[PDB]
Amino acid sequence: ADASPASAGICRIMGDLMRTMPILSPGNTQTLTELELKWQHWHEECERYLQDSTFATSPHLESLLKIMLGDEAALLEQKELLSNWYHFLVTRLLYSNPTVKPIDLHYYA
Amino acid sequence: PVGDGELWQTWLPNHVVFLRLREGLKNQSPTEAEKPASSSLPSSPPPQLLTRNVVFGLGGELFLWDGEDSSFLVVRLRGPSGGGEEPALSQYQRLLCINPPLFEIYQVLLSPTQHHVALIGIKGLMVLELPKRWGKNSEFEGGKSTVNCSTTPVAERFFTSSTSLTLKHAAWYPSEILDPHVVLLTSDNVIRIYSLREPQTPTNVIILSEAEEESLVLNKGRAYTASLGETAVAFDFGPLAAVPKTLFGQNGKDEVVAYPLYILYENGETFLTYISLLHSPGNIGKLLGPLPMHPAAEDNYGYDACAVLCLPCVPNILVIATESGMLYHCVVLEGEEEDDHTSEKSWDSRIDLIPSLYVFECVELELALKLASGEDDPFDSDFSCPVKLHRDPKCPSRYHCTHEAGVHSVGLTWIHKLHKFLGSDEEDKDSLQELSTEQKCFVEHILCTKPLPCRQPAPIRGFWIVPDILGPTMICITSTYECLIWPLLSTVHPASPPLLCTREDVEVAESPLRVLAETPDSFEKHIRSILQRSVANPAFLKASEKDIAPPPEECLQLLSRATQVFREQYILKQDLAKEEIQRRVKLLCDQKKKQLEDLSYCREERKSLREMAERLADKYEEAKEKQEDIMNRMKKLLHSFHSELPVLSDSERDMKKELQLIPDQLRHLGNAIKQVTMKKDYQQQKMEKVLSLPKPTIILSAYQRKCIQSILKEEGEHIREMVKQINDIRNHVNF
Amino acid sequence: ENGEKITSLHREVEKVKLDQKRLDQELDFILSQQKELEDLLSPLEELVKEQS
Amino acid sequence: VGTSEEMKMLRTESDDLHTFLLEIKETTESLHGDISSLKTTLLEGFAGVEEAREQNERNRDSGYLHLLYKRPLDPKSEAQLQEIRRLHQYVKFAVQDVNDVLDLEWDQHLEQKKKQRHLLVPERETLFNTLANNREIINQQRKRLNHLVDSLQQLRLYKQTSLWSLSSAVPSQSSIHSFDSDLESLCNALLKTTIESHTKSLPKVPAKLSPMKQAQLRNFLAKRKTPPVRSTAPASLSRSAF
Secondary structure, three states: OOOOOOHHHHHHHHHHHHOOOOOOOOOOOHHHHHHEEEHHHHHHHHHHHHHHOOOOOOOOHHHHHHHOOOOOHHHHOHHHHHHHHHHHHHHHHHHOOOOHHHHHHHOOO | OHHHHHHHHHHHOOHHHHHHHHHHHHHHHOOOOOOOOOOOOOOOOOOOOOOEOOOOEOOEEEEEEOOOOOOEEEEEEEOOOOOOOOOOOOOOEEEEEOOOOOOOOEEEEEEEOOOOEEEEEEOOEEEEEOOEOOOOOOOEEEOOOOOEEEEEEEEEHHHOOOOOOEEEEEEOOOOOOOOOEEEEEOOOOOOEEEEOOOOOOEEEEEEEOOOOOOOOOOOOOOHHHHOOOOOEEEEOOOOOOEOOOHHOOOOOOOEEEEEEEEEEEEEOEEEEEOOOOOOOOOOOOEOOOOOEOOOOOOOOOOEEEEEEEOOOOOOEEEEEEOOOOOOEEEEEEEOOOOOOOOOOOOEEEEEEEOOOOEEEEEEEOOOOOOOOOOOOOOOOOOOOOOOEEOOOOOOOEEEEEEOOOEEEEEEEOHHHHHHHHHOOOOOEEEEEEHHHOOOEEEEEEEEOOOOOOOOOOOOOOEEEEEEEOOEEOOOOOOHHHEEEEEEOOOOOOOOOOOOOOOOOOOOOOOOOOHHOOOOOOHHHHHHHHHHHOOOOOOOOOOOOOOOOOOOHHHHHHHHHHHHHHHHHHHHHHHHHHHHHHHHHHHHHHHHHHHHHHHHHHHHHHHHHHHHHHHHHHHHHHHHHHHHHHHHHHHHHHHHHHHOOOOOOOHHHHHHHHHHHHHHHHHHHHHHHHHHHHHHHEEEHHHHOOOOOOOOOOOOOOHHHHHHHHHHHHHHHHHHHHHHHOOEEEEEEEOO | OHHHHHHHHHHHHHHHHHHHHHHHHHHHHHHHHHHHHHHHHHHHHHHHHOOO | OOOOOHHHHHHHHHHHHHHHHHHHHHHHHHHHHHHHHHHHHHHHHHHHHHHHEEEEEEEHOOOHHHHOOOOOHHHHHHHHHHHHHHHHHHHHHHHHHHHHHHHHHHHHHHHHHHHHOOOHHHHHHHHHHHHHHHHHHHHHHHHHHHHHHHHHHHHHOOOOOOOOOOOOOOOOOOOOHHHHHHHHHHHHHOOOOOOOOOOOOOOOOOOOOOOHHHHHHHHOOOOOOOOOOEOOOOOOOOOOOO
């Protein structure tokens, strides 16, 4: 954004989506269903920017949006940036199941 | 979440306990089908059918009386909280009685202390003690499949001797602070309180009949008082109250506190008594009544009164109910003090102040569904049975009614207005004017088991309201042991104002929608108002594989009643909600268009204001250069108008002395500047001649930088709140 | 939210457009009064050219 | 009503233009100042024409010439002498001020060059001591501002609702020697959370009604007719399709 005043506006939409993501905070008195319903809005807002084609001027930012949406095809296009299968697992849980339980976990592994 | 709620609706009616009870009832039915009658006549009426509740719940488990084992069957409503395993349809505990009850049970009741259960029958009481919970699950005896429970018979020697005595009504005494006491009403018009410490002798006894001074005569007239309704039928407790100071001699000072017990007769008269188990029986326990019911009624408010319920509110609301399905809403108020004016010749100087009952409204229940018969038959027979009243454990403005043909829910919308009017100031008349606006109660037919005149009912055997584990949720169990479940609304909603959208729009500068940002629910609440139902079809119990097939004509009228209610109360309101969302979405599309046209005009004036400001700077410097040569013509003329003066003044000559002195001070200052420059040159060249070895970079750690960035945040946000608080005070203290 | 911005934005457009147009006219008044001063000054510049 | 992008473009291009309605306003409200300055220099000009008129006629008297021996300076000649005196005193002070700042730098260079011969660490604690100073200055202005609010509430000039305030946090060292202090801190916190006490009374009796509200409610309900609220069957089955 400092070097490239043509992408900088779109790079800041990406960066602001990277600030609206509902990550759990250990000091914070919320439910899992609150995290879940907020993350569902964030997903319904990220996919919205993919339908109006917002990132189709820089394919790197278009990939980052698919990764942040839990796209298992775009995540496997990143396999040369995932040095092991258990980092791929934790990435896939972050962007496809943030309310995962121990008794679901085997199937994802 | 939300999806947690649907699983229990499909699971619980299919649990193995409801399969056991639907198999026992089959095995009971083979034996008695063949003997021909011979000529005799029983000189006796049939027994009264008492509406039942042989079910309760505690902490998250449901308790059903199995009279074929003589036990409670105990089933859990809390699934494993994480585990990936399904809740086991086969799992329960049995709580078996050590001594079995020697009578048919029509009702069960848990104690205020939650440790003891009354087992209630027409000829007795037995009380069960709950076994101690422990183990990983807080289970009875740590998870045993059968547990044996202590059981104590109460008033046994009175019921086993007096063959013409029966129970009418029973409850626990309202205390968490005493031994558990049980209260009974029996077929002699006497109330009796028993201790579980002393279960064969009453702690207190209250006679309800006026029968002093005529003694030493026997028992027979019990036929003839009952024909006049002079039988006590039911009772309930109001909240803990300070006793009226007129009921004691003028000695006391301590304010005595007791429970008001309200008592109902078969004629529909009500009486009061103040009961304490903490004070001496001096005047405490005197009967007060009959309590006058206002306004006066020309039928006399029925003569078939069967149940009573005292709501935990101020003033008290006493619900009175009949076998005809009428429910009266009596507000209880203390009586009036009479002025000494204009009266004569009353003849006892001993008027206790007796409280008055005030009917706010009455409800008429559809006990079985009314259909379209002809106009010409004066002898169709309205289907009466003993109404059973229940308190809602999460909504103090709702109560529930179970009968033989179904279940009804009732919400008193005006209770919130009554608590408003009494809690505002003593000049507030307009909260009393709100109490006059015709928001009646709402009445809700949840379950129907007699949907047609021809059909036999399925009388309720179990009723409970779950508060916390399924949300607020109702559980009903039939005469056939079928389990039926409804989630209850958490709030008694009054009706909303009439349609906030008969508006025509008017343009000056601002949006009509600003007023609708002030409340976040605004538009969704307008749709929720349009969708507000005022009739619904009740949930129907399925027909049985032993029922008679009805005439087609009853089935057509039941269908047309149902499709009319769907057309009038659902379909019409959903298309009205659709037209409202169509109107709202259009206005937002057209306002969104306007904002792009508005923005695009301001985008062109962005150019206009620049191609104006540039020329205003051009035109200013033109006027400014012109001012300076006008002034530099002026400053020359004034200089010529002083040059023609023929002699030097005293001041010209003496300014000339000072101007001749300054050059030698400038000779010293113009060496001092050079001395300070050559000082700087020497110092700077002595700083330069050190810059040939490196300083170490002070790498503040990623956590130590984050520490300073957190402290500078806390302190910068404290500074913002102080700048704010100074301006907030300055906006209030204008001088 | 978008409307409260755009309707308040529009009001400062017409404000700056009013005050810029006021400065244009207060400059015409300065340029006119500077001439009244210049036509007044010039006769004093003639009297000194004769007296000298 | 739209896409997520349309409703966002309507925010950015509004703020990307609101920024310029400060840029072009600040130049407009500034140029009004210099246009007001120029009007002042114009009125100096109108005064100078009339000084020049009076002095031209004053120079034509033969009596006036006799007093010139005792004239003060003209106000322009003395204003230039007062400016020369002001500039002389300024050039004299700023020579001393710059001389003495250059010795205050230079003995501080000698002081740093003394300190450089006995080891390390002053460049850590000036940062934390300034933070500690700012943090008690924040507490002193906060102590003063509450005492003003107490005083204004004493005087009844101010009335308030309720407000709240903020708390601190700190991060750990990473580099491997603290763990038993991190644990003893946690141990003392667990010891300081171990159990508390019990109470007993009667319940509070509920509030009694006002006799005036009670008598009003009797006088309302005794006049109310009580027609029954029926279970509402649909009032015309004579609208069936069969």
